Nucleic acid binder design. Sequence first.
DNA 1: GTCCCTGTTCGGGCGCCT
DNA 2: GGATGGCGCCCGAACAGGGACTG
Lengths: 558, 405
Amino acid sequence: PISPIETVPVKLKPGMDGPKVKQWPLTEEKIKALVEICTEMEKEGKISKIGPENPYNTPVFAIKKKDSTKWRKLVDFRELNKRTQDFWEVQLGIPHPAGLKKKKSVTVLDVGDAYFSVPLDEDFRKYTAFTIPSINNETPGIRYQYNVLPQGWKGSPAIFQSSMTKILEPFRKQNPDIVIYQYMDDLYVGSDLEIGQHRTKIEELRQHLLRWGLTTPDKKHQKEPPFLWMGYELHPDKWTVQPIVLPEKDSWTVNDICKLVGKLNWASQIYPGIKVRQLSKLLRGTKALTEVIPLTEEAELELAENREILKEPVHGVYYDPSKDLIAEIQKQGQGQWTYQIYQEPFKNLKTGKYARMRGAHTNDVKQLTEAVQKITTESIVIWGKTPKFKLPIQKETWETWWTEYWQATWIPEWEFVNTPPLVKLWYQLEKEPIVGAETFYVDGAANRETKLGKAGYVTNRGRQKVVTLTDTTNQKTELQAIYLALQDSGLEVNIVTDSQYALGIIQAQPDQSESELVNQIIEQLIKKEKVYLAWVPAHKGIGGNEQVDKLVSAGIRK
Amino acid sequence: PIETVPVKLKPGMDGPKVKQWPLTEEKIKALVEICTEMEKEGKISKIGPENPYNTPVFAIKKKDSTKWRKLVDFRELNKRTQDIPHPAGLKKKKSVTVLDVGDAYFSVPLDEDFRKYTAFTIPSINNETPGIRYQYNVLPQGWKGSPAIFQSSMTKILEPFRKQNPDIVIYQYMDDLYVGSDLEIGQHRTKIEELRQHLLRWGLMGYELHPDKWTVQPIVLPEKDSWTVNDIQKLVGKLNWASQIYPGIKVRQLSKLLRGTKALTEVIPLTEEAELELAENREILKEPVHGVYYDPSKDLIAEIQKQGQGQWTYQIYQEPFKNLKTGKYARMRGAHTNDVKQLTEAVQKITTESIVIWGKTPKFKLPIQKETWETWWTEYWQATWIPEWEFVNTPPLVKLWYQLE
DNA sequence: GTCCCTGTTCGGGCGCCT
DNA sequence: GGATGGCGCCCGAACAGGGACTG
Ligand SMILES: [Mg+2]
């Protein structure tokens, strides 16, 4: 039937009018499937025949369902959507089985003909006009309009999900201890009741929905485990993801990699150790989906070790609120991280990965803090609380970092775990000038017009050197000078630069960088035993910042 | 009951469309319990997705109480809302108490054509349920127009208490009422309880301020008996920057001591003219900043520098190098120090001073990653207002300028 | 003013679930 | 083949903000 619920008032954008698009030709098979759908919907009152008083029209087309047998009537409302008002989507996320609590009895049933049972605003039904042909010369084409929610409209998902919440509100208020996970028309129902008393409560839900025009066909009424819910399999005490089959081409293109990485990201929620850095690196700078790209040696190696992880059995458990939430992070190279959330040892609730490369320059401690935040925000969505962490970083290594780091950074309750590779700082800048170390006064200068520059230094022991550069900037010359001082100094050196840009990068202690010049600076800083970096204002006559400034400015400035 | 007052937006500005951020379980349970009681009393109503506007919402649990306070981040709506002398004596009272009179805004209805802009969405744990949206029917708490529309009725209530106590300054900002006096500790609290009873006769907190103790942290210079090249180089760079604020600062004689290419650990004896130059600079930093006038039509900018060891320095200004106040904020120096928890306490004390001194919230430049702040800042918030902020990566130079020895 | 460098946000593609 | 919405990932693109530079 049709729900007796009040419609949602919808308007077009100001100054706009309904669409006027002609129907494209359709396959004979699709025409025969669209007429049986429309002839039955016209009887049920879900669509109404219109005449010449309706100047609007919108194409339609039909695709197969996941059931693969019946047909789904879709409408290409791309024009009406551009002219329809803006909505606020009520679906704030996707439910995850790790957030489910252990229930005594579980039922998963869906609503039949979900959209087509919710009415559409009467003043808006004229814009949803469509036309369907038939056997030519034997009967012309019929023109209907939607009296319910069409599949292809912008506002249909938000209106259905909102109306579904209003319908389930009296049942939830009356049965506050019956948990109903509501995703579109799928209904996961859990209770702490005996199976006989639970099935009684299910019929009360089916009679309540039937009162609001929503039927629950027995074909989609699951009564025994495993329950097929949101793409998982719910057993009484554990869950698992439906089988994931990776593609296996030999001439991988952009579109092929885009779906391989997409499936691996979906797999990393329960399969620990998934890494997609090298595969995602190939997709850089591409232009077309059909653009073929050969895999690299590290990409072949990364894809191989991923395929081995999926050929292993793994499952998740359900959340117990009386116990703690524990997250354990493991480090992979090239800024990759994986984590495992559990309450009992080796009984994971779920897993995951973090590899978002943030900032041009960073280190492992920054990336670990970023992973702690992404996990904390993700845990608040699924369980509503913050987990306790098990991080592969020493207490002293963290105390040292947030002591010298000028920004406020904090990690919640955690403890150190000895699971290499550990997170460490590969070098430490000195806080005071080094006694017995040669003092380098470095400076760089570049010309904006010709892109020519010079980087060099003068030392308090009489040494000086100047290197010419081509196609450089003023910031790069300042960095090139610091790299030159490290190259020609001993294991302990004092450097004085006038570039707060270069000083700010080095004080943050990066171990990886997009810039190869900065990486070369990082490698030098690791080999040094002591480094002290001071700053003086440029063009103020301070020595020996003046002697080096006059040396690099010669021939490129003034 | 009472006739509504029409309120519209600014020209060419749509309503707010900010997405709700994840809330913890104990905060959602509190908001659901509060919204149901607000809906029973007609203060809010359910709305659908045809309302394209949304404003985030959360809750705070005050110190020692099992009561939650609903908080709506309405500062994005206040920027779009269509646009009394500030008491200069409030910053001079011995003690000032802050009262939360936000409940009084529920007695006045809201303009019907404006209610659609005050929408918010209550999320569900693990997305068990789509977002349940509401909208306000009366004057919302934390909105710019709520104290303005209620300004007429507010003066009627406080008038007899203002007359009976002329030596008491009562200033209102957002859902807060600032009450200061020169009474002794005890008679002040007795007088605060008198106002609480007088405010409960109509319909229907923390902690305790002392604006007399609000001091400034001036730029101080190091004092040594043995100076090296590094010590003088760091001093010259600090005075060179400080001369942007204090034009009297000179650095001629200190710079000539560094002629040549010297080692950083070489000890340099101060000449008489250089030692005198350092003495004159210390007196200049003691003088107040000249020619700084408070412009109400511009934002108050507040920078914060993490100095470590629980020390936090801040400066309030509107124009570059035109500081209105430079102070510090120190807390516990333990090993379990929470940087985020200390930073939110700093921005609350700084905002509280701005509301007292100038009656406006400052715009913060916060030295913290954006993701780090939004994840934990609501767990330590305790005020009914929310100042606007941006996130920055400060140079470690400003850290050393406002340093402390 | 311009050039440079780095930050965040946005929408494109893919993955998953009427 | 030809629709919509949610969330996730990754990428490049279009901004905004601050610092340094020419004469
Ligand atoms: Mg320089």
